[PDB]
Design a protein around this ligand. Structure first.
Ligand SMILES: [Ca+2]
Ligand SMILES: [Ca+2]
Ligand SMILES: [Ca+2]
Lengths: 244, 244
């Protein structure tokens, strides 16, 4: 299992800033065996990343259309991402489920578009504070996972991001991460059988250089989906160190 | 003023295809007197267009975030579009009002982000079949316009696209396009005074080489927002001929 350090810039960096960032990462990047990096950027930054990122650092999108092509003004397809050199894409991020009303079935459809076009979808699931306060975070997140992976093949990454951990500074405990990661792997076995052992399950939500080692060190956590700490190369370099 | 031939590819063309299209257009394009072109593309195609479009052809986006920057996964900002070379952007397209639940107030916010970053917003308005059959197309479209231009400066383009004309083949008559353009201009004078006379008002919805001249020749129509006919260079060249 390759540990995966996925870097979600969200809506940050112009193409000019993406090029400088990737130039800076290039000067400072030393591969860690066992660890893949992926930079998930705004779609118009992908050209800069393809030109300026180091060899083995993958890059990808933050969303993708549910449709193959057509009269969907403002949407960007899996064929387009792929052609730009993307190898992965985030689907069903909490910010899109909330702000853009993406349903589980929409997420499944988006993941299926990714897979039809040679992209690795990173499928996000996770509960809100109210669900967590009820103690129902596992069964709700697994229900959300079944919906979101309906028709989705085994070439997928699952990212558990509790919504109360996103942008709040309230990182999940490593124990809480492993709780969901373990339950997620059980569900993946039901759906995918033996392939489940190879499916990467990430943790995301206020991940930082100082907490990432302990979270990813747990048995069923295979890496991280990183928000704010992805924006500065030194932070990236620290997180990478923690996973070496 | 200048007739504007605004070409909305919607969700079509990979960066490779965009490049090929701009190259073909470069070899075949002969400017028409008083006709400006703008190409409205998927955001990851902008780089291809910047490098390969011929002289005097603007390019721009199909949507823009209501926010400046931050934790909005999958969204693209006005500052990003500007940095990529965009000089304009579609906001409030019917497909986004319908598929992405964009309100008038959201469109107005998007338009303001555009203007704050040196982009010309193209604000779309237009009624559905139901409203048209009640004969209330003018008052409802003008109510939509007021809301979508709330706090928007006079450096704006208004595109009237009746929803029943989009992708259906059912082009408005030139007379019906002028009815809305003339009413829209009356509202623009209330909001913007003398500046209203220079605000470009476009018709869109099933525009073709065969119908574009009679529409664009109307007193208050200053160009077209073109969907399907924008995808093949030969169709662009025929629309251009019709405006010569
Ligand atoms: Ca582990
Ligand atoms: Ca994230
Ligand atoms: Ca259009």
């Amino acid at each position: 299992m390759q540990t995966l350090l996925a870097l979600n810039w969200k809506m940050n960096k112009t193409p000019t800033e993406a090029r400088s960032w990737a130039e800076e990462l290039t000067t400072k990047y030393a591969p860690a065996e066992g660890v893949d990096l992926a930079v998930l950027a705004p779609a118009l930054d992908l050209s800069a990343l393809a030109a300026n990122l180091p060899a083995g650092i993958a890059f990808g999108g933050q969303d993708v259309s549910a449709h193959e092509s057509g009269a969907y003004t403002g949407e960007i397809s899996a064929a387009m991402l792929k052609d730009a050199g993307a190898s992965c894409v985030v689907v069903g991020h909490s910010e899109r489920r909330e702000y853009h009303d993406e349903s589980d079935a929409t997420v499944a459809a988006k993941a299926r578009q990714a897979q039809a076009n040679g992209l690795l979808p990173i499928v996000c699931v996770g509960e809100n504070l109210d669900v967590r306060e009820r103690g129902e975070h596992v069964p709700q997140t697994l229900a959300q996972l079944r919906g979101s992976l309906e028709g989705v093949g085994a070439d997928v990454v699952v990212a558990y991001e509790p919504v109360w951990a996103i942008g709040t500074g309230k990182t999940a405990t490593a124990d809480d991460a492993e709780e969901l990661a373990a339950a997620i792997r059980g569900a993946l076995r039901e759906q995918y059988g033996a392939r489940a052992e190879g499916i990467r399950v990430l943790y995301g939500g206020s991940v930082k250089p100082e907490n990432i080692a302990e979270i990813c060190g747990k048995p069923n956590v295979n890496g991280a989906l990183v928000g704010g700490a992805s924006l500065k190369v030194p932070d990236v370099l620290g997180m990478l160190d923690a996973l070496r």
